Each structure stands twice: as structure tokens, then as C-alpha cells.
Design a binder for these strands. Structure first.
Ligand code: ZN
Ligand code: ZN
Lengths: 58, 58
DNA sequence: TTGATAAATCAGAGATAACC
DNA sequence: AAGGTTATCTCTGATTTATC
């Protein structure tokens, strides 16, 4: 479905297409992989860890 | 969108269709209307409020 | 093998509102 | 014009199948 949104890109990896918009502790629009990755390890997602796109499942 | 969900109906009004399945304190699924009504009033939505259909907005 | 991550996907809680 | 009922919108946390 729709991964975009009017005037928004991640406040970490700067993506404009995410299956779901999350939000960091400073209230800033981060994407899925950034919101998840942070919640888990507790350190920002590494830009080296930035792929090309998004996938599907089931 | 999807208004039904296999194996589920509202524990409070028995409807099988809703805009968003919620949960009561007992852990049972309840429809959007019943869940919101209880949160606002602290009493179960009465059967007298049950309506034939679901409306759409803007 | 197994175990730890990846991220989509699924939930649903709370917010915001439309509509009579 | 004001409000209650509850559709929708946002967003946080669990579930899941793959991938390392
Ligand atoms: Zn990002
Ligand atoms: Zn109900």
C-alpha cells in the first residue's frame, strides 16, 4: 500500500518510503527499520545498514 | 476495509462487523463502538444503542 | 543444527474528529 | 450552535518468517 506521506523523510536514514511511520524520543518522524532497530539495540540504525528498498511477507 | 475477522464477535453487543476490533478488560474482543463507549462512560454500551449499519465519514 | 538479529506484518490503544 | 457517539487517524508494542 502507501508508504509515503506529505512532507516527511526519516530523522536518521532520510528515507521517504516506509510501510509504517514511527517516531523517535525527540518526537521526530523515523521510519520502521529505524524505529524498530533503535527500540531493540538502543543505538541509532547505521547508514551502512541501509538497503535499496522494501520487501513483502506472507 | 476489512470489517470482519474469523472467530470473532463483540463480547458486549454480539456484532460481527466493526471498523476496529478492540479489547475489554477481560481480554475479549469488543467492537469499536463498545470499546470507546466503555472508555468514556465506565459502563457497558447498552443493547438499545446497537444499530443496523456502520456509517462512513469525510 | 542452533541461536541472535531483520523487518515486514499484525495488532490495538489512544488521538482526532466527522455527523446526526 | 453544542455535544455525544464512534469512524478514522497515529503511532507504539507484539508477532513473525527470513536472514546472519
Ligand atoms: Zn530511516
Ligand atoms: Zn459491540
Amino acid at each position: 500500500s502507501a508508504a509515503r506521506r506529505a512532507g516527511t523523510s526519516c530523522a536518521n536514514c532520510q528515507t521517504t518510503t516506509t510501510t509504517l511511520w514511527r517516531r523517535n524520543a525527540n518526537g521526530d518522524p523515523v521510519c520502521n527499520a529505524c524505529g524498530l532497530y533503535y527500540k531493540l539495540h538502543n543505538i541509532n540504525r547505521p547508514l551502512t545498514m541501509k538497503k535499496e528498498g522494501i520487501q513483502t511477507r506472507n
